[PDB]
Ligand binder design. Structure first.
Ligand SMILES: O=c1[nH]cnc2c1ncn2[C@@H]1O[C@H](COP(=O)(O)O)[C@@H](O)[C@H]1O
Ligand SMILES: COC(=O)N[C@]1(C(N)=O)O[C@H](CO)[C@@H](O)[C@H](O)[C@H]1O
Ligand SMILES: *Cc1c(COP(=O)(O)O)cnc(C)c1O
Length: 804
């Protein structure tokens, strides 16, 4: 494969030399007892050596040049594995492949040893990771800042058809990429009280937790740029035994990632994590600023991007530093703060927005609450000046929410304290200005923007689908890898017989490889000559895995009704993690496995239909299953999925999409042409009209015989004979408390699925439509998204110029 680079003779020689050297000196092993794991580590250290010179030169270059610095703060960075990504970005893949082969090893088998760095829940976490990759590739002096969790998202086991959570001890064998930096450890304060003297305010009597940074290299695509991701680790400050044991209390701050996707859990520990990242990060930012070329120019030299409201405390924290410590007058400090910060909102689901009770804030961060109240007062003074007499607007826009439990609306704080606020897909950003943040948009229309998400073509095409990346390069070269819009050139081949044959060959190759993986690793057998119908994403009610479930049972029931009637064979795969405390999501996973239990063992169905639940869906699994997918399920209720990103890996990897007009699905359909998509169901307007007159699930049940049959099968125990009432909760929700209107999209979804099967019956036309999708996926590269952030928000110009 040409996109994988050269395997120079000297390079290969040197690599084998360093591989053996590391096995000896670093791993302290000898070939006779070395395990595949040992070899994986020897290769990883060998590959890591190649990043060092560039890492040092890059950071040195920024200190010398002093460009504006981009600080991307996030509580999640779902990086996945690093070995292949590093070889790809450094053009070492073929060289290492040859070197390892000459050493009698299979590089791919070695790659399977590496643990996914799973410091993320799903979309938002992965976006942070794609963004890091694009910022480096675009030559931006960007710094990823987060927290080094000891345990990322739990490993999902399925036992008896149910999800079981196991700690994700990803650091057991170490992390060869990161570099501990204990020398740059910083103090973070908690609790305490505030004193107002003659020098202003003073935060005193605080408890200290130390933040120790660990730096990870972030390589751009062959431009010799290696940026940094700095993750903070909590350390206790500098009878007796119990006192030493109690050091765990402070160190617990960075122990584990809260496993919630699109759900706010107001736990004090989570608040600590948020302030922890923010306080330490901002000390780094101020220090760099001071040793650069004073505060008037701070915004010209610093950009702080908030990945949702998670690190929103950065606003009052910056004000605290500027006012309490640097002694800037409030007004000036605020001007600087707003010009420095920008907020990215990723959801409209109300239960996902952060609203911290004021008592928690008053106790844990007394000075920050005082600063927040002052920010609010001045902000509401401006609202009042702009809309005199509009008292309810004041109440609505306030950073303070009034109930039994007074809370602080973190999103309102972010809008008030940021010069830019953006949504993550056109429809979502428009919805923001129309509903949720309408008052704010009216007060400051210019603050509001859109930055449609993207995914990186390196990990999500070149790494995961080398076969596809190769046939594409065969026709248009390699420029598209960091200029995805060039994929448009592929429209010239919709009628090219060789390309049509190869696109289909590549997909079938991936399907065989994926089938081999499931047999080997999970001992699951799937029919390779079936349509691979895939819905992989976190289990949620709004994502409607349940709708997928209704369809699957429909397919089963239709086959049983007319057994001799031909149907396009399908392997329906659903995978994803459920937050541990999310009851319905866990019941849904169980229904999925229970459906398979019946469907997969009915002799009449045979291999015409199979339903499997893919265990432990994570980034590394996404890289295997997405390239093998024929149909991509993106069926959230219109208006609920802010953007989605899995939708865009599927499109880029040759799968056709069946989905609603939600999030970026809208833009995806627009780019490819609705005739090349399988859009169905209610649009946002329809959902609202239903909400206006009231959603009554009974009407659909009463009017659709096939739906009725399925609900009665669930309620009577057809999918749980030993426990007839097992799914009563799902049925009750669907029939009476379905916020996401599953029944309302059932008929159109089943009809749309019929249309999917019809096209699949025509391999040639299925493939030509696929080509029209791949060819128009360019807009969804994260390089485009990031270039937009740079020019429209950060005020810096991206660049593809190589470093020496
Ligand atoms: O005072 C200094 N003298 C010379 N080089 C420096 C100095 N401070 C930082 N650097 C260089 O700039 C890099 C950037 O460090 P940082 O951005 O503060 O993490 C350092 O690793 C050094 O190469
Ligand atoms: C707190 O809000 C979120 O986490 N929002 C989400 C997500 N759950 O991943 O963010 C990602 C990245 O923007 C979006 O693609 C997705 O539709 C949205 O739901
Ligand atoms: C991309 C990705 C997600 C987000 O997928 P959506 O379908 O947009 O929710 C979640 N998990 C992993 C492992 C991903 O790679």
């Amino acid at each position: 494969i040409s996109v994988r680079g050269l395997a120079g003779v000297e390079n290969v020689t040197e690599l084998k030399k360093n591989f053996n050297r590391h096995l000896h000196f670093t791993l302290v092993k000898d070939r006779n007892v070395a395990t595949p794991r040992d070899y994986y580590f020897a290769l990883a250290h060998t590959v890591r050596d190649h990043l060092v010179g560039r890492w040092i030169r890059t950071q040195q270059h920024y200190y010398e040049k002093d460009p504006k610095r981009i600080y991307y703060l996030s509580l999640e960075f779902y990086m996945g594995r690093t070995l292949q990504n590093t070889m790809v970005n450094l053009a070492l893949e073929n060289a290492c492949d040859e070197a390892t082969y000459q050493l009698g090893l299979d590089m791919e088998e070695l790659e399977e040893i590496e643990e996914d760095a799973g410091l993320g829940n799903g979309g938002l976490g992965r976006l942070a990771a794609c963004f890091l990759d694009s910022m480096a590739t675009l030559g931006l002096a960007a710094y990823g800042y987060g927290i080094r969790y000891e345990f990322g998202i739990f490993n999902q086991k399925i036992c008896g058809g149910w999800q079981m959570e196991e700690a994700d001890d990803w650091l057991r064998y170490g992390n060869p990429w990161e570099k501990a930096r204990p020398e740059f450890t910083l103090p973070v304060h908690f609790y305490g009280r505030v004193e107002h003297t003659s020098q202003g305010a003073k935060w005193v009597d605080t408890q200290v937790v130390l933040a120790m940074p660990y730096d990870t290299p972030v390589p751009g695509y062959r431009n010799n740029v290696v940026n940094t991701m700095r993750l903070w680790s909590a350390k206790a400050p500098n009878g007796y035994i119990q006192a030493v044991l109690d050091r765990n209390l402070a160190e617990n701050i960075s122990r584990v990632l809260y496993p919630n996707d699109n759900f706010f859990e107001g736990k004090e520990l989570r608040l600590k994590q948020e302030y922890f990242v923010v306080a330490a990060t901002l000390q780094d930012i101020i220090r760099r600023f001071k040793s650069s070329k004073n505060f008037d120019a701070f915004p010209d030299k610093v950009a702080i991007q908030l990945n949702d409201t998670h690190p929103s405390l950065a606003i009052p924290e910056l004000m605290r530093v500027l006012v309490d410590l640097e002694r800037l007058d409030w007004d000036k400090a605020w001007e600087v703060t707003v010009k420095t910060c920008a907020y990215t909102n990723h959801t409209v689901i109300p239960e996902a927005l952060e609203r911290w009770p004021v008592h928690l804030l008053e106790t844990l961060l007394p000075r920050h609450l005082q600063i927040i109240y002052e920010i609010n007062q001045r902000f509401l003074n401006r609202v009042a000046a702009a809309f005199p007499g509009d008292v309810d607007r004041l109440r609505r826009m306030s950073l303070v929410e009034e109930g039994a439990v007074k809370r602080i609306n973190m999103a309102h704080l972010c809008i008030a304290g940021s010069h830019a606020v953006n949504g993550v897909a056109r429809i979502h950003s428009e919805i923001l200005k129309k509903t949720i943040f309408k008052d704010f948009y009216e007060l400051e229309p210019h603050k509001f923007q859109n930055k449609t998400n993207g995914i990186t073509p390196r990990r999500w095409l070149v790494l995961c689908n080398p076969g596809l990346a190769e046939i594409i390069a065969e026709r248009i070269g390699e420029e598209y890898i960091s200029d995805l819009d060039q994929l448009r050139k592929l429209l010239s081949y919709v009628d090219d017989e060789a390309f049509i044959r190869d696109v289909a060959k590549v997909k079938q190759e991936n399907k065989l490889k994926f089938a081999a993986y499931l047999e080997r690793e999970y001992k699951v057998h799937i029919n390779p000559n079936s349509l691979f119908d895939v819905q992989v994403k976190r289990i949620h009610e709004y994502k409607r895995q349940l709708l997928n479930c209704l369809h699957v049972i429909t397919l089963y029931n239709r086959i049983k009704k007319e057994p001799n009637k031909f149907v396009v064979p399908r392997t329906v795969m659903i995978g994803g993690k459920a937050a541990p405390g999310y009851h319905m999501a866990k019941m849904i996973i169980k229904l999925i496995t229970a459906i398979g239990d019946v469907v997969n063992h009915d002799p009449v169905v045979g291999d015409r239909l199979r339903v499997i639940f893919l265990e432990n869906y994570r980034v590394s699994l996404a890289e295997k299953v997405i390239p093998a997918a024929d149909l991509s399920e993106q069926i959230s209720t219109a208006g609920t999925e802010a953007s989605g990103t899995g939708n865009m890996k599927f499109m880029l990897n040759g799968a056709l999409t069946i989905g609603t007009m939600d999030g970026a699905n809208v833009e995806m359909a627009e780019e490819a042409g609705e005739e090349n998509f399988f859009i169905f169901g209610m649009r946002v307007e329809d959902v609202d009209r239903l909400d206006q007159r009231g959603y009554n699930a009974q009407e659909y049940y009463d009017r659709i015989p096939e739906l009725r049959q399925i609900i009665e099968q669930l309620s009577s125990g057809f999918f749980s004979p030993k426990q007839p009432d097992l799914f009563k909760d799902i049925v009750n929700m669907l029939m009476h408390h379905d916020r996401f209107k599953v029944f309302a999209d059932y008929e159109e979804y089943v009809k749309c699925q019929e249309r999917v099967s019809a096209l699949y019956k025509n391999p040639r036309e299925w493939t030509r439509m696929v080509i029209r999708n791949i060819a128009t996926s360019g807009k969804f590269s994260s390089d485009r998204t990031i270039a937009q952030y740079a020019r429209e928000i950060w005020g810096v110009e991206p660049s593809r110029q190589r470093l020496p």
